[PDB]
Amino acid sequence: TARLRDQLGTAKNANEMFRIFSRFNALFVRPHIRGAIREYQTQLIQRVKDDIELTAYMKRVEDVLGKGWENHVEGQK
Amino acid sequence: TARLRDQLGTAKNANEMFRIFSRFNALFVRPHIRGAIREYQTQLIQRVKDDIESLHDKFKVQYPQSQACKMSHVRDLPPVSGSIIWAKQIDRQLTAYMKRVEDVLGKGWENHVEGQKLKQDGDSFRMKLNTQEIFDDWARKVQQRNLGVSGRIFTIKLKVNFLPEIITLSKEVRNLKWLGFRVPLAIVNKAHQANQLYPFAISLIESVRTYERTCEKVEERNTISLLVAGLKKEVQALIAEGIALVWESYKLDPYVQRLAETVFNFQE
Amino acid sequence: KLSLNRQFFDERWSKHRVVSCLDWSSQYPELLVASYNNNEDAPHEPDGVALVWNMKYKKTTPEYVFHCQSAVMSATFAKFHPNLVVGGTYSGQIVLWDNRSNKRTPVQRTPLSAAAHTHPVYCVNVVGTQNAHNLISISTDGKICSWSLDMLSHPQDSMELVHKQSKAVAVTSMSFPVGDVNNFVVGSEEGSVYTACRHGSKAGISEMFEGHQGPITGIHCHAAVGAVDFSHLFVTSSFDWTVKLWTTKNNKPLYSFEDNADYVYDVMWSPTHPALFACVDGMGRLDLWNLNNDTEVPTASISVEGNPALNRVRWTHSGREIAVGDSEGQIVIYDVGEQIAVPRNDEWARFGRTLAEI
């Protein structure tokens, strides 16, 4: 989680956020890291929604919600 | 007994030797050990008499006159529960000092030459500390008021029928339940409804206040009425939708949010 | 030796007000922010007030002044935003003040929605790092919410502290261990001290700690850092007239100090000395307990003039100047003798030995 804080300490735009998200896959499933993801989702997913309102952008959305991104309550929409 | 003389050879203040008797309490059950310690028991009994005198003096000062009531109100504790807590803490300290006397004099302290007066004073003071009358009076007053939140959410200046006291009753129930007093079922249901409907009522009254101030600002500057017509008629339509609803309606969960959001929009 | 170094008071703002909370700026140790609730006599006056006093200059008046419509029950410095001051209010509306901005009105205020705070917020803190941090706020209905300073309109995270099935916790005080970001401790009005976890599978109340038979008034974890890790110790002051020392691993209190003759409204560890903490009671008495010297009598004691109901106490990050606020808005600052404040090199080993003695 200290590393996760360092992620926002390092990345500035959305692309580096998604890159360092892709480097860390196991962190999406364990139900302790997701709180940190909830800190970043409002910064990223909403922004990505603001960018949408294709397949590349669905990859952008997927990279924040992990594998099988359609299962999440936010990924349903 | 040499070690029990080393007790005073080492101990300095009364608290340390109180703790020493507490730790060595069983050892004084022996008759020779009990007879060894005679002059220190009088000193500690007089100190406990001083302390229970201090408790008596504190209890002479009425609870509203004491800083306890003020600091309880400052820390969100309701005044009736604050008085109950004050009486309970005084009772706890009385019991602790009674246990200290038992430890100092050993078992059979109720018949001791000095412990008889202490037992009598403790019994009378504990009888005076009984709190059930306060709970009975408060419950009777609340039941006689017969407070009720059920009804239309709105009434017509616009207003929302939700007073501050409904929260204070809920907090009174919250503290008294921990204090163990059997609150009546009707009071429990009233506190339940208060707790559930408090945030919705706060959102609704805040939205109404925001709409009132924004409407006053718009009316004070009539030149800008046209650009803000859509938000005005939108919030008025939402308010009209809210007239038919009651506090038991399930539509309040989004409504108190959604209207407020439009009201928030109506500010910007 | 306890010597009154300074005497802060304002006849207009702080008069007829109690000091609800205190805090020191970590970056600027000279500064001191303090909170004051609603004035009883004059409803025309703003209810919540937040005053910033200074130790560098002899200016009697506050260095800065802020106010808001609801009584400010807690105030704090943003530990990584020196220009910002945060405050939790009786209405539950968190408010923000910027010293760069000249507005006495709050620059950013949270909503009073159901998802946001609605009950009074006695507990506000900033937790995290410079690279990223969160404003954690807990109300008296058990609701905890994490916000961001850049955006107070929406709660970044929120939940409810619930333990023992259908039963909320009326959090009165909070504290975070040093070096801990996820775990914290809170004090209910029922006396049960709950150790809780921010994020996790068991996020919420994790452990119960019993022993206090009155409402908790103030909790603080071991802020002193040294070779021996004592971060698991924390002290609680309650309405029992007691200060209880607890271990987070141990479900029963390590020790109890009962010398106080009235309620104990606040206690906090010395930030530099490991075994020294300071409490303030209702008889206007401030007591410094050093567990490496004594355990049944305060190591130092002083009485405030007029004997007001002392409410809050805080130490300076240097660990020398102690600022305590009372029930007459009369903040009083004391300086301690160097033999008490500064620890000897063996105070940590001696503290470990005294803990083992228990």
Q: Which two tokens stand for residue C312?
A: 């809050």
- Note whether C201 contacts A32, CB cutoff 8 Å: yes
Q: How far from C265 is each of B170, C7, C47, C217, C327, CA to CA, in Å?
A: 24, 21, 22, 5, 11
User: Hey, what amino acid is at A68?
Assistant: G
Pick among A1, A5, A7 to test the C interface (most C CBs inside 10 A): A5
Rounded to a whole number, what is the distance in Å from the CA of C106 to chain A's nearest CA? 24
Q: 3-class SS at B11? A: coil
Rounded to a whole number, what is the distance in Å from the CA of C348 to chain B's nearest CA? 24
Rounded to a whole number, what is the distance in Å from the CA of C146 to chain A's nearest CA? 9
What is the DSSP pairing of strand B159-160 with strand B154-155? antiparallel
Cα within 13 Å of Cα(A30), Cβ side: 10
- Note whether C189 contacts B77, CB cutoff 8 Å: yes
Q: Please report residues of C whose CB lies closer than 8 A to that of A9.
A: 129-132
Rounded to a whole number, what is the distance in Å from the CA of C225 to chain B's nearest CA? 30
Q: 3-class SS at A4? A: helix
Angle at A69 between CA A63 and CA A74, to 5 degrees: 105
What's the 3-state SS for C223-260?
CCCCCCCCCCEEEEEECCCCEEEEECCCCCCCEEECCC
Q: Which two tokens stand for residue C121?
A: 């917020």
Pick among B15, B20, B51, B71 to test the C interface (most C CBs inside 10 A): B71
Q: How far from B167 is each of B119, B129, C18, C284, CA to CA, in Å?
A: 42, 28, 23, 32
Experimental method: cryo-EM
Cα R_g (chain B), whole angstroms:
31
Rounded to a whole number, what is the distance in Å from the CA of C114 to chain B's nearest CA? 5
Q: Which two tokens stand for residue A21?
A: 């998200």
Who among B67, B74, B199 is closest to C114 (CB)?
B199
Q: What angle separates helix B67-74 from helix B79-105, to the nearest 10 degrees?
A: 120
Do chains A and B touch by CB distance (3+ pairs < 8 Å)? no
- Residue C323 β-bridge partners: C314, C333
Cα R_g (chain A), whole angstroms:
12
Helices and strands (H, E) in chain A, number of each type: 5, 0
Cβ(C50)–Cβ(C67) under 8 Å? Answer: yes
What is the DSSP pairing of strand C3-8 with strand C331-335? antiparallel
Residues 6+ apart with CB under 8 A from B222: none
Residue with tokens 């937790």: C127
Phi then psi dihedrals of residue C4, to 5 deg: -70, 105
The count of residues in chain B is 268
Q: 3-class SS at C30? A: coil
- Note whether A42 contacts C134, CB cutoff 8 Å: no
Residue C30: Cβ within 10 Å count: 14
Q: Which two tokens stand for residue C79?
A: 């530990």
Task: Nearest chain A residue to C133 by CA: give it.
Answer: A5
Note whether B52 contacts C: Cβ–Cβ < 8 A: no
Residue C315 CA to its chain's centroid (Å): 10
- Residue C243 β-bridge partners: C237, C257
Residues 6+ apart with CB under 8 A from C132: A5, A8, A9, A39
Pick among C199, C201, C202, C206 to test the A interface (most A CBs inside 10 A): C199
Who among C113, C282, C309 is closest to B257 (CB)?
C113
What is the H or E stretch that residue A14 is in?
A: helix A14-22
* Gaps in chain B after residue (C–N beyond 2.5 Å): 156
CA–CA separation, B183 and B170 (whole Å): 11
In the 8-state DSSP scheme, what is residue C171? E
Cβ(C277)–Cβ(C270) under 8 Å? Answer: yes
Cα R_g (chain C), whole angstroms:
19
Start-end of H helices in chain C: 338-341, 347-357
User: Hey, what amino acid is at C74?
Assistant: S
Cβ(C242)–Cβ(C257) under 8 Å? Answer: yes
**C115-131 burial string, b = 16+ CB within 10 Å, else e?**
ebbbbbbbbbbbbbeee
Rounded to a whole number, what is the distance in Å from the CA of A6 to chain C's nearest CA? 7
Q: Which chains form contacts with chain C, at 3 or more CB pairs under 8 Å?
A: A, B
Who among B13, B75, B202 is closest to C172 (CB)?
B75
- Note whether B74 contacts C311, CB cutoff 8 Å: yes
User: Hey, what amino acid is at B177?
Assistant: K
Cβ(C149)–Cβ(C194) under 8 Å? Answer: no
Residue B60: Cβ within 10 Å count: 8
Phi then psi dihedrals of residue C60, to 5 deg: -65, -40
Q: Please report residues of B whose CB lies closer than 8 A to that of C37.
A: 74
Sign of the CA dihedral running B161, B166, B167, B168: positive
Start-end of H helices in chain B: 2-10, 14-23, 31-36, 39-60, 67-74, 79-105, 115-128, 132-145, 165-178, 185-220, 229-243, 252-267
In the 8-state DSSP scheme, what is residue B224? G
Query: Nearest-CA neighbor of C286 among C356, C237, C345?
Result: C237
CA–CA separation, C218 and C351 (whole Å): 23
Q: Please report residues of C whose CB lies closer than 8 A to that of B178.
A: 189-190
CA–CA separation, A61 and A49 (whole Å): 8
Angle at C58 between CA C57 and CA C62, to 5 degrees: 85
CA–CA separation, B37 and C33 (whole Å): 55
Who among C128, C199, C200 is closest to A5 (CB)?
C128
